[PDB]
């Protein structure tokens, strides 16, 4: 809706930084609204949905078990490990690591999962093979958040991420069980409270994943809709702003308010 585009452009001028935006109809794939949809932005932790989609694809094909226990050690830990730092003795199952990576944005969880699938290059090959020739993960946590200007490593485009999220959640790529599990993890997101969720009315469905990075980078991908079911994909990225985390949060939340008001 053009009022949301007005809000996105206003968020741009208030942050002093590029904002990328797309609304996709979930079932048809039709682009409903967009701004800078074919410019590159750092994914930050939004890649962890794609990571666990790859993990689930391995489960589908019998190459992985969600119940498999991974024992890791202090040398595996990287900055921001709220779940994994509490299970050095007992380890964590693959299911528990995807839960921690998606619902808590746990960085060690994501690195352990990257190791199980063979690394960022293999995630990129997975994306390539499902027809996304834009999104690329090149590094591990935490370096992938560096957001160097004009650096295409660890970036996506809003349109590419939106289309790829649609294929993961509704396409035939994942089995029905894995489609449901990935959506369930995203619906159980614990860390994106101040973003789209703060504008969401009662009775609506949302499954999302946020990200934050260096140089003011911030973003969210979501499947949301009224009547307790997802019916659109929304992707919002920004990078380059010197504004505070609260102000970047508020700008994304206000885009969400406009998105929901003019649904």
């Amino acid at each position: 809706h053009p009022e949301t585009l007005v809000k996105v452009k206003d968020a741009e001028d208030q942050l002093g930084a590029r904002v990328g935006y797309i609304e996709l109809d979930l079932n048809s794939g039709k682009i409903l609204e967009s701004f800078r949809p074919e410019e590159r932005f750092p994914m930050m932790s939004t890649f962890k949905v794609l990571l666990c989609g790859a993990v689930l694809s391995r489960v589908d094909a019998g190459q992985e078990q969600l119940g498999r226990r991974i024992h890791y050690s202090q040398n595996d830990l990287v900055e921001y490990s709220p779940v994994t730092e509490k299970h050095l003795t007992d380890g964590m199952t693959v299911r528990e690591l995807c839960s921690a990576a998606i619902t808590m944005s746990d960085n060690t969880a994501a690195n352990l999962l990257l190791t199980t699938i063979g690394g960022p290059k293999e995630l990129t090959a997975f994306l390539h093979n499902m027809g996304d020739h834009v999104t690329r993960l090149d590094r591990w946590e935490p370096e992938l958040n560096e957001a160097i200007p004009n650096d295409e490593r660890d970036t996506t485009m809003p349109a590419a991420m939106a289309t790829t999220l649609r294929k993961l959640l509704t396409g035939e790529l994942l089995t029905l069980a894995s489609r449901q599990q990935l959506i369930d993890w995203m619906e159980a997101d614990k860390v994106a409270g101040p973003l789209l969720r703060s504008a969401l009315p009662a009775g609506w469905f949302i499954a999302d994943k946020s990200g934050a990075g260096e140089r003011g980078s911030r973003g969210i991908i979501a499947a949301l809709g009224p009547d307790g079911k997802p019916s659109r994909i929304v992707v919002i990225y920004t990078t380059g702003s010197q504004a505070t985390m609260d102000e970047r949060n508020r700008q994304i939340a206000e885009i969400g308010a406009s998105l929901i008001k003019h649904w």
């Binding site: 040398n75 830990l77 050095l88 934050a212």
Partner: protein, 164 residues
């Protein structure tokens, strides 16, 4: 207020669950789910989440005692002087005092500390985060840091990111 580094230092091993909630402010805190029977308390927004502390307990009992303290972005180093050269001088087997003398007495904060045999100190584990002059950040990721970990007060390993 929210959870803070001051509150983190005031909470001690052996405190009950109620003592922890009283110091942290229970409205900041949660248990269950991903955190099990630990108590997890949030501070200011940071990264993709919030500065936080996580307090582990000997059991799920109401009289359970703190046997583990973890934090992220609540503590800041008082005088960060770590460098890659100093990191290179840190050797497995060093005591905590030998490490601190090597990397700088004000370069480190406690990442996690756990007493698996509480109230005994046997097998105590300690993770420090240590920072170079501009490596610490309270709201973004670190830009020059090391993880140094100990068992029974003896350095077991080290890892660094972005030191020069």
């Amino acid at each position: 207020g929210v959870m803070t580094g001051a509150k983190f230092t005031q909470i001690q091993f052996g405190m009950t669950r109620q003592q922890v909630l009283d110091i942290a402010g229970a409205e900041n805190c949660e248990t269950g789910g991903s955190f099990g029977d630990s108590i997890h308390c949030r501070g200011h927004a940071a990264g993709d989440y919030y500065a936080y502390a996580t307090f582990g307990f000997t059991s799920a009992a109401a009289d359970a005692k703190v046997d583990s303290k973890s934090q992220w972005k609540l503590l800041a180093p008082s005088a960060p002087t770590l460098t890659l050269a100093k990191f290179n001088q840190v050797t497995v087997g060093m005591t905590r005092a030998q490490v601190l003398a090597t990397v700088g007495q004000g370069s480190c904060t406690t990442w996690s500390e756990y007493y698996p045999a509480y109230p005994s100190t046997a097998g105590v584990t300690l993770s420090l985060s240590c920072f170079d002059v501009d490596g610490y950040s309270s709201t973004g990721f670190y830009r020059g840091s090391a993880h140094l970990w100990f068992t029974d007060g003896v350095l077991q390993g080290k890892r660094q990111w972005d030191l020069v």
